[PDB]
Structures are given as structure tokens and as C-alpha cells.
Amino acid sequence: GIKGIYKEIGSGERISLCKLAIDHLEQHNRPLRLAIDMAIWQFQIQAARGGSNPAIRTLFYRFVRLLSLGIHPIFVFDGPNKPGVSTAMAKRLIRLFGFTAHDAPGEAEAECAYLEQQGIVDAVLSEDVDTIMFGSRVTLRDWSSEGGPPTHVTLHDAKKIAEGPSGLDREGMVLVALMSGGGIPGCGIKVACQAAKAGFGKELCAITEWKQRLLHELRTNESGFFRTKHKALEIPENFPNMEVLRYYTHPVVSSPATIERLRQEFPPSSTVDIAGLREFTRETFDWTFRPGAIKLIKVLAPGLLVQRCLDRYEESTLVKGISMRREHFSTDATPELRVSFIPAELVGLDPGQEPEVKPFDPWQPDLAWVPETILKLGVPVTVEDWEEGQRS
DNA sequence: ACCCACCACCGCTCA
DNA sequence: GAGCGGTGGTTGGT
Ligand SMILES: [Mn+2]
Ligand SMILES: [Mn+2]
């Protein structure tokens, strides 16, 4: 649920997460804040195979990707007030990356939408579009390839939907969920959408006046709100159930006090725990000894580089040089510079103090495409010299 | 009596 | 959660 909603509101704009990140950083002069429904992982990460704990290993890699994007994420967990990777390990790993874990009192997607409304986050990444019913304005879904590397997302805009052909707004979709559900039998997304379009989605708190209006409209269709008449659809008395109505209208979410607490404490003083990550990966992935250390260095270095650029907003302690420029399609033509750096020097781990058991040398220069905007923010002098040398 | 377009629903598969 | 074909039902007819 809601089944068939995408044929009504649209499938959504497919867009590079990098583009969303960099555009917001340019438009709003600070990194994008994104609430992530923790329920999204449940079917995406238990598809990885091989090695030790591949499910949380997938989680590790998408966290490194979040670093590379410069996104400030907050992962929201479900609460018990709702009407196989460990939560403990997920939260432990979230802290090691300098990210934020947040426990909803009830359903996470309701909390995520609430956080967005309160200006705690700029957008929501969830299983589906249910977030719109809980007040979300910008909601993201399907963080995946476009495949290979997971670079793109599917963006739904609540205002544009309420204007587009469906005319489905928040209270329209509630009525759809009220009548269709998954409650009137024989109904019915098509009819529910037509009922919503007629404006029956208010529901501004003796409600039986309203109920026998559309009930009259469903069987006679004198206003012509429908393609046909529906004398077969017969409506229960409990309906419209009002517990259900305000499960959407005021879902159980964090207290005002919690909101203002988050408002001062998120984003946190984000810092990646290197030594913490080294122990985690050794314990959980069997990334043991010198090979395991080098493996962590290689994977973590680029994101750690991006992350430290923004955090200052000669310092060649980050970028050793620049050599190219591109507007690749994977980022929807977001200007990137080919950047060099020393992985082990940047991560700050010495593979030597670990036992030894073509290849990759963490002490030699590695290359990475980093968004030009982030580089100008973090290493402005090196970028100007690159621009200077290239007008010759 | 029968056709017909539309639709709601079920079972299916992959996440 | 979300895509597919079947299909049984409803509607408005033919
Ligand atoms: Mn949920
Ligand atoms: Mn949902």
C-alpha cells in the first residue's frame, strides 16, 4: 500500500544523489540533511553474499558512499508505539561513522516526515510514498544503480503532486488510504481518487452528514464525480474509522522537547572514528592483520577526504594535486575534479603495526573524482592553481 | 442473453 | 514494496 499510487501521482523524478547533495550545498550554503527510514535496508542488504556478515558489510559501503556525498544523515529506527542484521550493530556502526541514530516513538516514516516538517532534515529517504501522508514534502525512494554503483534516487515532490493531474494532496491520499486501504470493499483506488478529487478529503472533524453525501454521490453520481455509479459498493458503519483518520492526521511522533533537542544537536560534531572502524571491521568482516588494514584504508580514504573538506567550512594534507575535470552522467553532469591523495596518510593508519600474512600501496598516490564545489570549499588554493595552470 | 471496458483483487516474482 | 497476468465483478450497454 498504496497499491497503484504511482500510476496516479507519477513514478517520480530519477535523479543523482550527488546532484541533490551538491545543488543543496550551493543553494543553501550547508550540507544536505537527510532522514533515512531504517526499514529500507531490510530487503536490499540481505542480497549480498560471501565473506563475514555481508548484510552489514553492504551497510558499511553505503555509509562510505554517504561520506563521499557529504550528506549529514540521520537514521530513524521504529518505536514500539506502532498501531537479519542487528539493530545494536547498525547503531554502533552509525556512531563510528560520525552519523546520527534516532529512535522514533512509533513508525519511523511518520517520524521522518515530522523531522522534515520541523526543518530538522531537508528530505526523507523511505520505502515508499506513505511519508507524504505524514506530512513529507520532498521524499526519496529506491536508492540504487542506474546496473552497478548505487548513484541515483527517485524523488517525489508533494506540492507538484497536488498540482499535477492526480490532485492528490496529503488529505487526498489519506482518503484514498481510508477508502481503498488494503475500509470499503470493492474500493478501489480509481474511485477513491475520484472521491478525493471531488474534495471529500476534508475531514475537518456528527460526521455522518459528509458520509451520506458521497454515499449519495456514489450511487446516483448526479455531480458526476465518477465514471459510473456504484450501488454495489456498500459502506460499513465503523467507516469512516476515526482512529485511522488521525493515525495519519496526528501520528505518534517525538515530543516538542525532543524536536528542539535535535534542533541543537543535529548535525553532530561529525568525526569518523578510524581506530573504532578498524576494530569493527576486524571483528565483523574478518578484515584481519595488514591486509585487513589496507582494505579499510582503500575503501575509507575517498569519503574521509570529502568529509574533511566540508569540515573546514599548507593544507595539501588533503589533496596532493588535480589533473582533470568532468561532467559525468552518473552525477547528472555535476562538475568534478580528478584529485590525488595518499590514502594511508589521509586515513592515519599504519599497516606496519599489523602482522604481515600489481597490488595496492596505501602510501602511493590514489585518484578520486570529487565534486568541484566541495573542493572549492575545502581546498580553494589548490583549485585556483589548477584553474590557473589550465588557462595557459 | 451476451458482450464490453474498466477495475479490484489475488498470486506471482524480486527486492 | 512494487511490478506483472489472470480473473471474477461491476457497469453500461448491445
Ligand atoms: Mn515503516
Ligand atoms: Mn509504507
From TrEMBL:
Domain XPG-I as annotated: residue spans: 95-167
Domain XPG N-terminal: 1-83
Region forming the signal peptide: none
Residues where Mn(2+) 1 binds: 109, 127
Name of this protein: Nuclease-like protein
Chain positions recorded as Mn(2+) 2 binding sites: 128, 130
Range of the intact protein held here: 2 to 465 of 922
Domain of life, per lineage: Eukaryota
Binding site for Mg(2+): 109, 127-128, 130
Parts of the chain that traverse the membrane: none
